[PDB]
Design a binder for these strands. Structure first.
Length: 295
DNA sequence: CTTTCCACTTATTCGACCTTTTACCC
DNA sequence: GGTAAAAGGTCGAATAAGTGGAAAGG
């Protein structure tokens, strides 16, 4: 088991970390409700190692299957939440998820005082939960109708370690095959992209200045609105993006995708993508990265 | 009772992907 | 005549968040 750099861990949490506050109907409870407070990450089986490493880094949490194709790390044992708070107090989140963390911290304090054992603290936890992630459930939105009433987070990228973490969840290393009527028949284009909910526009815009390259693609759709930070200029990929992740290590199978991407970059730098042979090799590498990778 | 764990589900959030247009090069 | 860069824009599933039930344990 390997230890994860704390800022890489925070970046990955900004991407995929999920805070939880269960407030459940419970007849065997003196107040009528029981609670469970925590932090979790659920991902594809192929990246179970990440969870194990996080588990090894913090020395907390339990790992369990999440259906047939996924696996989770869940931390809800109360004393162990202190580890999580100490971590994020030293290496804070910078996306809108910071808001959720804050609510989680609030909940922690309530439960630390054991106030969740009386009805007043249950009410307070419901008020906190109302602003957390998806907010109140329908059942809770019937038992507490008086509870109905979030400020934008705006924070800077702290360093490239954070970026390695975040890119491990929200980034994509892609080999694009531009098809035409040329004798070669295809233009090879490396693409780097990071994709994120439009509420974090400030952060996404800042990637352009932080990395010194790229541009934003905006998506305004019926099911979601988001931004892609994109780099397609080869000299920026080769001289800026690749060095960043060579010194700030990605986690998960995406590291392999990055390494394959770098192979193609080498071929493009040598102009071998302008030959049938090198082209065939590139197509071969592309075939087996991202969705094509075998585990 | 209360906390913690473990099997399992929902519905999001787009990563990953391909096409088409525009910009620039020899 | 080329190749490079950006823009345009889809969608299936791995996320993100949550749920049911019960053992563990104080």
């Amino acid at each position: 088991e390997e230890s994860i750099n704390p800022w890489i861990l925070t970046g990955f949490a900004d991407a995929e970390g999920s805070f939880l506050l269960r407030i459940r109907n419970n007849n065997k409870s003196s107040v009528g409700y029981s609670t469970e407070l925590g932090f979790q990450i659920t991902l594809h089986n192929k990246d179970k190692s990440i969870l194990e490493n996080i588990q090894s880094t913090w020395k907390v949490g339990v790992i369990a299957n999440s259906g047939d194709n996924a696996v989770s790390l869940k931390v809800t044992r109360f004393e162990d939440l202190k580890v999580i708070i100490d971590h994020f107090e030293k290496y804070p989140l910078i996306t809108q998820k910071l808001g959720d963390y804050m609510l989680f911290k609030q909940a922690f304090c309530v439960m630390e005082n054991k106030e969740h054992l009386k009805i007043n603290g249950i009410k307070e936890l419901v008020r906190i939960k109302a602003k957390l992630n998806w907010g109140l459930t329908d059942e809770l939105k019937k038992a507490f109708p008086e509870i109905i009433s979030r400020s934008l987070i705006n924070k800077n990228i702290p360093n490239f370690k954070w970026l390695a973490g975040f890119t491990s969840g929200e980034g994509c290393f892609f080999v694009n095959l531009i098809k035409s009527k040329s004798k070669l028949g295809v233009q090879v284009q490396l693409v780097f992209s990071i994709t994120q909910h439009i509420k974090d526009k400030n952060l996404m815009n800042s990637l352009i200045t932080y990395l010194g390259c790229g541009y934003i693609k905006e998506y305004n759709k019926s099911e979601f609105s988001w931004l892609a930070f994109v780099v397609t200029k080869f000299s920026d990929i080769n001289d800026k993006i690749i060095p960043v992740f060579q010194e700030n290590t990605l986690i998960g199978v995406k590291l392999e995708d990055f390494e394959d991407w770098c192979k193609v970059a080498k071929l493009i730098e040598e102009k071998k993508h302008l030959t049938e042979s090198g082209l065939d090799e590139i197509k071969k590498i592309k075939l087996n990265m991202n969705k094509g990778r075998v585990f």
